Amino acid sequence: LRNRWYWKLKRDTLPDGDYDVREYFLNLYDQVLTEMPDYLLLKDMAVENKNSRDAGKVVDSETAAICDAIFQDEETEGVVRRFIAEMRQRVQADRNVVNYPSILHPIDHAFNEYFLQHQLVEPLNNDIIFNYIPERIRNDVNYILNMDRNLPSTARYIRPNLLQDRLNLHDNFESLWDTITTSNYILARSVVPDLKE
Amino acid sequence: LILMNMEQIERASDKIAQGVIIAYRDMQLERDEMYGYVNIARNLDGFQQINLEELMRTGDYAQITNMLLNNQPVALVGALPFITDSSVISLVAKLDATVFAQIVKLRKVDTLKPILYKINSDSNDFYLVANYDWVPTSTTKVYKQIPQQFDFRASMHMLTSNLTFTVYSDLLAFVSADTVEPINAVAFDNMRIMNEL
Amino acid sequence: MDVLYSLSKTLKDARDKIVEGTLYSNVSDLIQQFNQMIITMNGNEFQTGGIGNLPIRNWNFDFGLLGTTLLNLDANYVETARNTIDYFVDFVDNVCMDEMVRESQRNGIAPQSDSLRKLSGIKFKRINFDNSSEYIENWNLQNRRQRTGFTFHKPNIFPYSASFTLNRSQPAHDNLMGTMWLNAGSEIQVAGFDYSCAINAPANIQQFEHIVQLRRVLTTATITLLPDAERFSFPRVINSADGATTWYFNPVILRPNNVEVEFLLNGQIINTYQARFGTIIARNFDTIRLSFQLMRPPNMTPAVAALFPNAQPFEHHATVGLTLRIESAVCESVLADASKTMLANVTSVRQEYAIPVGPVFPPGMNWTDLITNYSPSREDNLQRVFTVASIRSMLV
Amino acid sequence: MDVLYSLSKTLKDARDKIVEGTLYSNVSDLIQQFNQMIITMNGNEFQTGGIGNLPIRNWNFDFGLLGTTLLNLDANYVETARNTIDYFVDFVDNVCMDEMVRESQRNGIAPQSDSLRKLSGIKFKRINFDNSS
Amino acid sequence: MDVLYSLSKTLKDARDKIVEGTLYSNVSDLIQQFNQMIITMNGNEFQTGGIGNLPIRNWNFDFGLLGTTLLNLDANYVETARNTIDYFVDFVDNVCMDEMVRESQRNGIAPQSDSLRKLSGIKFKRINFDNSSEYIENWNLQNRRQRTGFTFHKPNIFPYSASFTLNRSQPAHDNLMGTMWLNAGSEIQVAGFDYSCAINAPANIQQFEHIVQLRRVLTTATITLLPDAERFSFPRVINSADGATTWYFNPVILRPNNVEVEFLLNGQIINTYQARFGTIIARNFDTIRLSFQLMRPPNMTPAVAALFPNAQPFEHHATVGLTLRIESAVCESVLADASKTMLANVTSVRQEYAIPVGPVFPPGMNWTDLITNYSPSREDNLQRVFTVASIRSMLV
Ligand SMILES: [Cl-]
Ligand SMILES: [Cl-]
Ligand SMILES: [Zn+2]
Ligand SMILES: [Zn+2]
Ligand SMILES: [Zn+2]
């Protein structure tokens, strides 16, 4: 006379055959990589907990739906119901931190926890911008560089990956290297100044 | 993360089983909370395993054909679509044993669709189970896993992030950059680039 | 005191209840009390002083409040709570030690250390919650001039005293009549000796009276009374009252006669026990009067008749005894006792930091000297340091 | 023997490296090896023998994998790891004791206990890693 | 302690791995750990204290992170790393030295120097990583009340003692029966001597017993037992026990008879070896009982019969020896051994900086005095300073 709660795939689209299942998971890997976030701000996903007795919020609206369904269920333990009604987010604006309750499958939790714990945004300040300028231009007295902007402590940036060539295209890739030097030559042509007088 | 959770994700799918055991002995249907009576195999212990992907790739059906002709108990392993049969009459007709001969006929395994019996009070002929003394058995079992139950304690997490920040991309846009008059531009040696004036 | 005790009690509750896997609802009220404590203490600087060898220590409180996020507490939550609790326990122990080593003649009941005086400020009153221990309850009731009492198993109510009174004496100390007694802690072992065995007494009876004035009133006292005094029933060579020479004592124990234990309060006869031995109850008294008679046995067997001749020399001195043991009592003032560690704790702290002798307590917190001259100021200071010591014992 | 050594080395590394506050990158390879060990051991029953006074002991493996997605290991992570580590250490110690008290004349270098013979099966070869002692 | 060890381990790894030309993939995890250490330490001020003659030193950390954008490390990268590494190594050496020279009776296991207490704060726990050393492994295990284990080659478990007991003696010291022994380090040499050669002993057997009580339980101990004691097999002039007079010893060595080595735990015989000498195993014991008999040989050649007359004077004294050498053992407590350097390092640091004697250790860290009275507080302080010494010896 009662149903039971079980975890199910939201999208059950797995093919038949082991090789096609492994292909499915490669495609899943590509999907995760393309949709992988560079940063997260949970407050954007924070919604209201309908059964909260303390102005509680949860992330995300799917958690809200699940929590409401559990709260209404007659087979739920009274302690779980009371905890849903009492569980609280913590917003510490002074520390620039937020904590929200979420309901997640352990695998979903692992993915979201990895995204939260490995964001690509670093603090951005004037020293980092100044060092971003090439050093030989910071030392040329023909150029006057000034920092007339105040960056808040909330400023972030993503560092470019300027690793030197791991493929060594200058070695034994004649056609590719010809193309690389041609494109670089075109760009350098665009930036060379025109002669005057 | 994907590689470690692949098996769990694949076994959660409702449209593929992980294999099928052909045991030409009469095995009692398991009693599972998710099905009622079900010819479900928890594992493959006690059977020779034929990998279906390898069989598809090689094209060599000698061992499988010899085993099927001689009624040699075997376990076909691989992602398989299955038919959910809720008819007690289908089990009494032993139709789950009728699905493998096409493997030999066609030397293919991509149309193998084993029968997963699901016998419970919702079956139209369930009275046969209820009103007679007999053990429902079948000679085949489907290697499939049971859904994981939702557990609130194992699903509730606190997600933490920053309250808010602004990401920037054009770092050099924060730099005010002037130049001296070109008449006064100097070279590395601190003398004017052009001195003929 | 109430704030210091509340801090200690909150910390003890946190240490006992904020445990891995416990229901969030086990700790909700405790988490609220703990957060109130943290909020009150945040942004306050404390200095625990440098009296004696106790080091000067500085305490800063900038701690985050505990969350409420898991249905069952996990190891991370307990770790954060334990960090905060450990710092707070260190601070409370240092405040308790600092208070335990100070004293004042005039306001000995009031706080003495800087930190406890600060904690008496109105701002910290919010920390205060359940004051349920015997000592804090007695403290609160005493601040309100309400009747309350401390229960003591074997109260150390008698200052140590092992002396004798001679009522009949000679330079040669061979025909002696008098009393010996040991008053120690909760025990009074008294004995009356007649060397002549009351040969020349008016009715062959020698009367002995021992009066012990308790320095504080005891109530609801359970007392064991036994006929003999085992401490004065073996031969002894005893110094004379000035110590010029030594006399000899060769007791032979006889049954005490007309034994009368009177427990007196304000000179009134509160409890009277005639010839009763074993367990007796003294309702409420400040004085014990033990009156017992040595009666020469009217009929003697020849060995007994030979023990006691009619005239000197006397070799077998007739001794009657009495042993009184206060096994448990109630006193309106704090006292050392056999079960509690408050005196030992205060003394250990004072000895281990070389606290100079103050103007209230005797050197080394000697209990005999303290109880002998148990003045009201000493009572106030001792109640303060004992309450602080009991607060300290809840954590250390 | 190589598999038993790999189990022990994995457990020793997990004890030494899975500690509170540590960067996950310090332990990432070890966590991969540990999860591989769990996967290979899950679903197998072992019996360490009753030779002499050494008691008969039965061992079952239905352990979950350790997490991989934290920047720094926390107290919860250490407690979860320790629970599995203790069982695996007990099993490895019992297998070692069962193998240490047995001998054979015909083939004394080959494993003697049932558990070590089972662990020599190809299905456990995945556990094998750095053999440095 | 684990944070101090983690700093030292990171510095050792950086010294070994950050080398010119090496693949960055060889160091990526080490670089991440090193940068985490730099971030955690940056902005923190430390003072390594001025106990004894150890100079006060102030440490400031404002260091840049090591780069992550190379394929192979070059000379620039190595030099940038090495400056920071030098500063950090100096800091860790000074922290370790500050901790090694300190002790306390109360919490000798706990940190004593200010810098190590600071490093115990949660804001440094991120530095913590692989705790693979035996000393740090046992430190973590003992923090959790888990079974610890230290492996010792020739453990210094016996305090030095060159003594004798005379069970038969007289002022002439010419008919003596007794035992002499040197218990030093991991070696026990014992020798039972009878001057009369058990001429009058019952059955012509003289039984000698030597019980040595180890101050800690040793497990899995490999021991060499040898029949003779070369230290008591040559003529000596030995002082008397009071030191008043000197007696003479002129041993002639007979092989010991019915040799019984018992290894006992709480007085229960765990291991028993009878007439076996080569190499034995004591699996778990804290007491060694050596029983050995001088048996007057029933048949003698004329020279031997000349050595041993029926009565005094006795000029050739029949001695039966025994040697017991613990080659390797396992102890749950730290110990000095012949291979390690923890005791030597701690003693050297305390000597070089003229550290005054403290409440816990004997002067000069003398090992005989220490191990004779190996109290629990002494064990805690010793494990702390020995773990710190090993951490220091990783870098110095
Ligand atoms: Cl008692
Ligand atoms: Cl050696
Ligand atoms: Zn008692
Ligand atoms: Zn006198
Ligand atoms: Zn002598």
mmCIF file of N, CA, C and O in Angstrom, chain E residues 26-93:
data_model
loop_
_atom_site.group_PDB
_atom_site.id
_atom_site.type_symbol
_atom_site.label_atom_id
_atom_site.label_comp_id
_atom_site.label_asym_id
_atom_site.label_seq_id
_atom_site.Cartn_x
_atom_site.Cartn_y
_atom_site.Cartn_z
ATOM 1 N N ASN E 26 57.523 15.300 -12.557
ATOM 2 C CA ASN E 26 58.138 14.652 -11.406
ATOM 3 C C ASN E 26 57.847 15.382 -10.105
ATOM 4 O O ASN E 26 57.914 14.761 -9.042
ATOM 5 N N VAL E 27 57.507 16.669 -10.164
ATOM 6 C CA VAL E 27 57.427 17.519 -8.983
ATOM 7 C C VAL E 27 56.058 18.152 -8.791
ATOM 8 O O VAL E 27 55.863 18.869 -7.808
ATOM 9 N N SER E 28 55.096 17.895 -9.683
ATOM 10 C CA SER E 28 53.837 18.641 -9.667
ATOM 11 C C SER E 28 53.151 18.563 -8.309
ATOM 12 O O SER E 28 52.730 19.582 -7.751
ATOM 13 N N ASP E 29 53.014 17.355 -7.768
ATOM 14 C CA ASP E 29 52.401 17.204 -6.455
ATOM 15 C C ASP E 29 53.259 17.844 -5.371
ATOM 16 O O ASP E 29 52.736 18.511 -4.471
ATOM 17 N N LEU E 30 54.579 17.670 -5.452
ATOM 18 C CA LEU E 30 55.465 18.325 -4.499
ATOM 19 C C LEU E 30 55.356 19.838 -4.610
ATOM 20 O O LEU E 30 55.371 20.540 -3.598
ATOM 21 N N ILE E 31 55.242 20.361 -5.832
ATOM 22 C CA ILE E 31 55.110 21.805 -6.003
ATOM 23 C C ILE E 31 53.805 22.293 -5.393
ATOM 24 O O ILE E 31 53.765 23.341 -4.745
ATOM 25 N N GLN E 32 52.718 21.550 -5.594
ATOM 26 C CA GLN E 32 51.444 21.949 -5.007
ATOM 27 C C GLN E 32 51.512 21.949 -3.485
ATOM 28 O O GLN E 32 51.029 22.881 -2.833
ATOM 29 N N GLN E 33 52.118 20.911 -2.904
ATOM 30 C CA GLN E 33 52.290 20.854 -1.456
ATOM 31 C C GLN E 33 53.156 22.008 -0.956
ATOM 32 O O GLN E 33 52.840 22.641 0.057
ATOM 33 N N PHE E 34 54.244 22.300 -1.666
ATOM 34 C CA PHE E 34 55.141 23.382 -1.281
ATOM 35 C C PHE E 34 54.441 24.735 -1.340
ATOM 36 O O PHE E 34 54.602 25.566 -0.439
ATOM 37 N N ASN E 35 53.655 24.972 -2.390
ATOM 38 C CA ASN E 35 52.926 26.229 -2.499
ATOM 39 C C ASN E 35 51.864 26.337 -1.419
ATOM 40 O O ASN E 35 51.619 27.426 -0.893
ATOM 41 N N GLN E 36 51.222 25.220 -1.080
ATOM 42 C CA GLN E 36 50.277 25.225 0.029
ATOM 43 C C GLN E 36 50.975 25.592 1.336
ATOM 44 O O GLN E 36 50.444 26.373 2.133
ATOM 45 N N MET E 37 52.171 25.046 1.569
ATOM 46 C CA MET E 37 52.931 25.421 2.757
ATOM 47 C C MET E 37 53.253 26.909 2.748
ATOM 48 O O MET E 37 53.127 27.585 3.775
ATOM 49 N N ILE E 38 53.671 27.437 1.599
ATOM 50 C CA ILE E 38 54.005 28.857 1.518
ATOM 51 C C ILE E 38 52.779 29.710 1.820
ATOM 52 O O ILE E 38 52.856 30.686 2.572
ATOM 53 N N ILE E 39 51.630 29.355 1.244
ATOM 54 C CA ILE E 39 50.414 30.128 1.471
ATOM 55 C C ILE E 39 50.030 30.089 2.941
ATOM 56 O O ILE E 39 49.665 31.111 3.531
ATOM 57 N N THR E 40 50.096 28.908 3.554
ATOM 58 C CA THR E 40 49.710 28.781 4.953
ATOM 59 C C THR E 40 50.646 29.566 5.866
ATOM 60 O O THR E 40 50.191 30.240 6.795
ATOM 61 N N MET E 41 51.952 29.485 5.624
ATOM 62 C CA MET E 41 52.918 30.145 6.493
ATOM 63 C C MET E 41 53.009 31.643 6.234
ATOM 64 O O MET E 41 53.346 32.399 7.149
ATOM 65 N N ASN E 42 52.712 32.087 5.014
ATOM 66 C CA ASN E 42 52.870 33.495 4.671
ATOM 67 C C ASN E 42 52.052 34.371 5.610
ATOM 68 O O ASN E 42 50.891 34.077 5.901
ATOM 69 N N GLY E 43 52.669 35.446 6.087
ATOM 70 C CA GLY E 43 52.016 36.384 6.971
ATOM 71 C C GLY E 43 52.060 36.035 8.441
ATOM 72 O O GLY E 43 51.554 36.814 9.255
ATOM 73 N N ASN E 44 52.646 34.903 8.812
ATOM 74 C CA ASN E 44 52.711 34.478 10.202
ATOM 75 C C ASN E 44 54.090 34.773 10.772
ATOM 76 O O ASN E 44 55.109 34.518 10.128
ATOM 77 N N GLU E 45 54.111 35.321 11.980
ATOM 78 C CA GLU E 45 55.345 35.642 12.681
ATOM 79 C C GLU E 45 55.603 34.587 13.744
ATOM 80 O O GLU E 45 54.691 34.214 14.486
ATOM 81 N N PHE E 46 56.836 34.095 13.805
ATOM 82 C CA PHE E 46 57.213 33.108 14.805
ATOM 83 C C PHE E 46 58.411 33.596 15.600
ATOM 84 O O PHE E 46 59.263 34.323 15.091
ATOM 85 N N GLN E 47 58.466 33.188 16.860
ATOM 86 C CA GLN E 47 59.621 33.434 17.711
ATOM 87 C C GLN E 47 60.099 32.102 18.257
ATOM 88 O O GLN E 47 59.368 31.435 18.995
ATOM 89 N N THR E 48 61.306 31.705 17.878
ATOM 90 C CA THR E 48 61.966 30.574 18.507
ATOM 91 C C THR E 48 62.738 31.098 19.709
ATOM 92 O O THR E 48 63.571 32.004 19.582
ATOM 93 N N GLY E 49 62.448 30.514 20.870
ATOM 94 C CA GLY E 49 62.673 31.168 22.138
ATOM 95 C C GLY E 49 64.108 31.166 22.592
ATOM 96 O O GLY E 49 64.994 30.593 21.964
ATOM 97 N N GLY E 50 64.315 31.832 23.725
ATOM 98 C CA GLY E 50 65.630 32.020 24.297
ATOM 99 C C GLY E 50 65.855 31.261 25.588
ATOM 100 O O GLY E 50 66.420 31.804 26.540
ATOM 101 N N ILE E 51 65.397 30.011 25.644
ATOM 102 C CA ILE E 51 65.736 29.142 26.764
ATOM 103 C C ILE E 51 67.231 28.855 26.748
ATOM 104 O O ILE E 51 67.833 28.654 25.686
ATOM 105 N N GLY E 52 67.839 28.830 27.931
ATOM 106 C CA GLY E 52 69.265 28.547 28.013
ATOM 107 C C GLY E 52 70.067 29.580 27.250
ATOM 108 O O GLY E 52 69.874 30.788 27.407
ATOM 109 N N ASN E 53 70.988 29.105 26.416
ATOM 110 C CA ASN E 53 71.756 29.962 25.524
ATOM 111 C C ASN E 53 71.237 29.946 24.094
ATOM 112 O O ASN E 53 71.839 30.582 23.225
ATOM 113 N N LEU E 54 70.151 29.239 23.827
ATOM 114 C CA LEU E 54 69.592 29.211 22.487
ATOM 115 C C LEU E 54 69.154 30.623 22.107
ATOM 116 O O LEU E 54 68.344 31.218 22.828
ATOM 117 N N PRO E 55 69.657 31.203 21.018
ATOM 118 C CA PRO E 55 69.345 32.611 20.748
ATOM 119 C C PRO E 55 67.904 32.803 20.298
ATOM 120 O O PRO E 55 67.340 31.975 19.580
ATOM 121 N N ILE E 56 67.310 33.913 20.739
ATOM 122 C CA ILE E 56 65.983 34.282 20.270
ATOM 123 C C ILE E 56 66.058 34.570 18.780
ATOM 124 O O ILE E 56 66.948 35.293 18.315
ATOM 125 N N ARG E 57 65.138 33.989 18.020
ATOM 126 C CA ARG E 57 65.092 34.206 16.582
ATOM 127 C C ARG E 57 63.667 34.519 16.155
ATOM 128 O O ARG E 57 62.716 33.894 16.626
ATOM 129 N N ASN E 58 63.529 35.496 15.267
ATOM 130 C CA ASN E 58 62.237 35.916 14.743
ATOM 131 C C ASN E 58 62.136 35.507 13.283
ATOM 132 O O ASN E 58 63.071 35.723 12.508
ATOM 133 N N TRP E 59 61.009 34.908 12.919
ATOM 134 C CA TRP E 59 60.797 34.348 11.594
ATOM 135 C C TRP E 59 59.595 35.010 10.943
ATOM 136 O O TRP E 59 58.502 35.039 11.522
ATOM 137 N N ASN E 60 59.814 35.534 9.740
ATOM 138 C CA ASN E 60 58.792 36.172 8.926
ATOM 139 C C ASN E 60 58.701 35.457 7.589
ATOM 140 O O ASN E 60 59.722 35.140 6.974
ATOM 141 N N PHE E 61 57.479 35.222 7.136
ATOM 142 C CA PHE E 61 57.227 34.482 5.905
ATOM 143 C C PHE E 61 56.444 35.380 4.952
ATOM 144 O O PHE E 61 55.248 35.614 5.148
ATOM 145 N N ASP E 62 57.133 35.913 3.942
ATOM 146 C CA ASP E 62 56.493 36.542 2.782
ATOM 147 C C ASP E 62 57.242 36.037 1.551
ATOM 148 O O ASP E 62 58.178 36.679 1.073
ATOM 149 N N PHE E 63 56.817 34.892 1.038
ATOM 150 C CA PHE E 63 57.502 34.217 -0.050
ATOM 151 C C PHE E 63 56.552 34.046 -1.223
ATOM 152 O O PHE E 63 55.354 33.822 -1.038
ATOM 153 N N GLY E 64 57.092 34.170 -2.424
ATOM 154 C CA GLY E 64 56.320 33.885 -3.606
ATOM 155 C C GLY E 64 56.128 32.399 -3.821
ATOM 156 O O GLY E 64 56.890 31.561 -3.346
ATOM 157 N N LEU E 65 55.070 32.068 -4.549
ATOM 158 C CA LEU E 65 54.823 30.682 -4.898
ATOM 159 C C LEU E 65 55.816 30.217 -5.953
ATOM 160 O O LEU E 65 56.358 31.011 -6.722
ATOM 161 N N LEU E 66 56.073 28.919 -5.961
ATOM 162 C CA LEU E 66 56.871 28.317 -7.015
ATOM 163 C C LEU E 66 56.045 28.209 -8.288
ATOM 164 O O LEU E 66 54.846 27.920 -8.246
ATOM 165 N N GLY E 67 56.693 28.447 -9.421
ATOM 166 C CA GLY E 67 55.994 28.416 -10.684
ATOM 167 C C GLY E 67 55.470 27.037 -11.025
ATOM 168 O O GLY E 67 55.953 26.010 -10.554
ATOM 169 N N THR E 68 54.444 27.019 -11.869
ATOM 170 C CA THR E 68 53.831 25.778 -12.308
ATOM 171 C C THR E 68 53.829 25.622 -13.820
ATOM 172 O O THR E 68 53.272 24.642 -14.321
ATOM 173 N N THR E 69 54.465 26.534 -14.555
ATOM 174 C CA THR E 69 54.306 26.602 -16.001
ATOM 175 C C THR E 69 55.599 26.287 -16.740
ATOM 176 O O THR E 69 55.977 27.012 -17.660
ATOM 177 N N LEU E 70 56.287 25.225 -16.346
ATOM 178 C CA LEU E 70 57.451 24.732 -17.062
ATOM 179 C C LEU E 70 57.228 23.274 -17.432
ATOM 180 O O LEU E 70 56.406 22.579 -16.833
ATOM 181 N N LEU E 71 57.968 22.824 -18.439
ATOM 182 C CA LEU E 71 57.996 21.412 -18.792
ATOM 183 C C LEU E 71 59.150 20.689 -18.109
ATOM 184 O O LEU E 71 58.982 19.567 -17.626
ATOM 185 N N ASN E 72 60.319 21.314 -18.070
ATOM 186 C CA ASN E 72 61.458 20.842 -17.301
ATOM 187 C C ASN E 72 61.947 21.985 -16.432
ATOM 188 O O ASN E 72 61.981 23.136 -16.873
ATOM 189 N N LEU E 73 62.314 21.669 -15.195
ATOM 190 C CA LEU E 73 62.841 22.690 -14.303
ATOM 191 C C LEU E 73 64.196 23.168 -14.799
ATOM 192 O O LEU E 73 65.031 22.374 -15.234
ATOM 193 N N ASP E 74 64.409 24.471 -14.733
ATOM 194 C CA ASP E 74 65.648 25.101 -15.153
ATOM 195 C C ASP E 74 66.351 25.700 -13.936
ATOM 196 O O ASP E 74 65.860 25.630 -12.810
ATOM 197 N N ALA E 75 67.515 26.304 -14.182
ATOM 198 C CA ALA E 75 68.333 26.826 -13.091
ATOM 199 C C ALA E 75 67.614 27.936 -12.334
ATOM 200 O O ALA E 75 67.691 28.004 -11.100
ATOM 201 N N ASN E 76 66.921 28.822 -13.054
ATOM 202 C CA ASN E 76 66.139 29.868 -12.403
ATOM 203 C C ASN E 76 65.183 29.280 -11.380
ATOM 204 O O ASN E 76 65.109 29.738 -10.232
ATOM 205 N N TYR E 77 64.426 28.269 -11.800
ATOM 206 C CA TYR E 77 63.436 27.657 -10.929
ATOM 207 C C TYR E 77 64.087 27.062 -9.688
ATOM 208 O O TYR E 77 63.578 27.219 -8.571
ATOM 209 N N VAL E 78 65.215 26.379 -9.867
ATOM 210 C CA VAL E 78 65.879 25.735 -8.744
ATOM 211 C C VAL E 78 66.384 26.775 -7.754
ATOM 212 O O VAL E 78 66.247 26.602 -6.543
ATOM 213 N N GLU E 79 66.976 27.865 -8.243
ATOM 214 C CA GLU E 79 67.468 28.894 -7.331
ATOM 215 C C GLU E 79 66.327 29.567 -6.572
ATOM 216 O O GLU E 79 66.430 29.804 -5.353
ATOM 217 N N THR E 80 65.233 29.881 -7.272
ATOM 218 C CA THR E 80 64.084 30.475 -6.601
ATOM 219 C C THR E 80 63.553 29.544 -5.522
ATOM 220 O O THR E 80 63.211 29.988 -4.422
ATOM 221 N N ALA E 81 63.472 28.249 -5.818
ATOM 222 C CA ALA E 81 63.031 27.299 -4.807
ATOM 223 C C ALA E 81 64.019 27.224 -3.649
ATOM 224 O O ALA E 81 63.612 27.155 -2.487
ATOM 225 N N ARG E 82 65.318 27.258 -3.948
ATOM 226 C CA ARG E 82 66.329 26.964 -2.943
ATOM 227 C C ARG E 82 66.462 28.076 -1.915
ATOM 228 O O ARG E 82 66.736 27.794 -0.746
ATOM 229 N N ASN E 83 66.273 29.334 -2.311
ATOM 230 C CA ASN E 83 66.290 30.399 -1.306
ATOM 231 C C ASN E 83 65.200 30.184 -0.254
ATOM 232 O O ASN E 83 65.461 30.204 0.963
ATOM 233 N N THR E 84 63.968 29.965 -0.713
ATOM 234 C CA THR E 84 62.861 29.718 0.202
ATOM 235 C C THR E 84 63.100 28.462 1.024
ATOM 236 O O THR E 84 62.794 28.426 2.221
ATOM 237 N N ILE E 85 63.633 27.417 0.392
ATOM 238 C CA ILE E 85 63.893 26.174 1.105
ATOM 239 C C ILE E 85 64.907 26.406 2.216
ATOM 240 O O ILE E 85 64.766 25.872 3.314
ATOM 241 N N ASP E 86 65.951 27.188 1.943
ATOM 242 C CA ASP E 86 66.956 27.470 2.961
ATOM 243 C C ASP E 86 66.332 28.174 4.153
ATOM 244 O O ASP E 86 66.581 27.812 5.312
ATOM 245 N N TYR E 87 65.510 29.189 3.886
ATOM 246 C CA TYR E 87 64.868 29.884 4.995
ATOM 247 C C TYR E 87 63.989 28.933 5.799
ATOM 248 O O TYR E 87 64.017 28.938 7.037
ATOM 249 N N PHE E 88 63.209 28.101 5.111
ATOM 250 C CA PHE E 88 62.297 27.200 5.804
ATOM 251 C C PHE E 88 63.052 26.143 6.599
ATOM 252 O O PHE E 88 62.629 25.764 7.693
ATOM 253 N N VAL E 89 64.152 25.633 6.049
ATOM 254 C CA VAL E 89 64.958 24.642 6.749
ATOM 255 C C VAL E 89 65.545 25.248 8.014
ATOM 256 O O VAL E 89 65.555 24.617 9.076
ATOM 257 N N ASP E 90 66.035 26.485 7.923
ATOM 258 C CA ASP E 90 66.534 27.166 9.112
ATOM 259 C C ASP E 90 65.435 27.294 10.161
ATOM 260 O O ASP E 90 65.652 27.021 11.351
ATOM 261 N N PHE E 91 64.239 27.695 9.729
ATOM 262 C CA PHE E 91 63.127 27.856 10.660
ATOM 263 C C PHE E 91 62.762 26.536 11.327
ATOM 264 O O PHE E 91 62.526 26.488 12.538
ATOM 265 N N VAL E 92 62.695 25.457 10.551
ATOM 266 C CA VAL E 92 62.306 24.170 11.110
ATOM 267 C C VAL E 92 63.371 23.671 12.076
ATOM 268 O O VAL E 92 63.056 23.110 13.128
ATOM 269 N N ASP E 93 64.646 23.874 11.741
ATOM 270 C CA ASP E 93 65.714 23.492 12.654
ATOM 271 C C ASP E 93 65.589 24.237 13.975
ATOM 272 O O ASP E 93 65.736 23.643 15.049
#
